[PDB]
Write a protein that binds this ligand. Structure first.
Ligand SMILES: *[C@@H]1O[C@H](CO)[C@@H](O[C@@H]2O[C@H](CO)[C@@H](O)[C@H](O)[C@H]2NC(C)=O)[C@H](O)[C@H]1NC(C)=O
Ligand SMILES: *[C@@H]1O[C@H](CO)[C@@H](O)[C@H](O)[C@H]1NC(C)=O
Lengths: 48, 48
């Protein structure tokens, strides 16, 4: 149990860095947003 | 001329419906109408 406590609590420790130091972490979600803002922006340029 | 109120405007034959406001945009002497991403006229220069 103690050995797993250290291994678990350290594992959650690494997630922070992998999230904060890497922009590609959310690259799925950031694309889901960058598709709509891409689709609407193009839909406005169509007026030209 | 009416500023800051919804009006039906004719400027140099360009017609439409807008809210005429002041602006700091600076046209070179030969430019008359400004245009937008949608090419709908954003800014005009008061002729008189
Ligand atoms: C199982 O592996 C863990 C680590 O994967 C071992 O725990 C490490 O033991 C060393 C001592 O050799 C320490 O320097 C580390 O700090 C320990 N890590 C943790 C997270 O406690 C553990 O000793 C291994 N057990 C067996 C039976 O081999
Ligand atoms: C139009 O006439 C007014 C006065 O009647 C004058 O102030 C104005 O300068 C004239 N238009 C232009 C573009 O100068």
């Amino acid at each position: 149990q103690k050995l797993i406590a250290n291994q678990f609590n350290s594992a959650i420790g690494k997630i922070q860095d992998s999230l904060s130091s890497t922009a590609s972490a959310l690259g799925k979600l950031q694309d889901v947003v960058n598709q709509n803002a891409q689709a609407l922006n193009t839909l406005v340029k169509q007026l030209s | 001329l009416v500023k800051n109120k919804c009006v039906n405007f004719n400027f140099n034959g360009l017609t439409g419906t807008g809210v005429l406001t002041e602006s700091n945009k600076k046209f070179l002497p030969f430019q008359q109408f400004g245009r937008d991403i949608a090419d709908t006229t954003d800014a005009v220069r008061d002729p008189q």
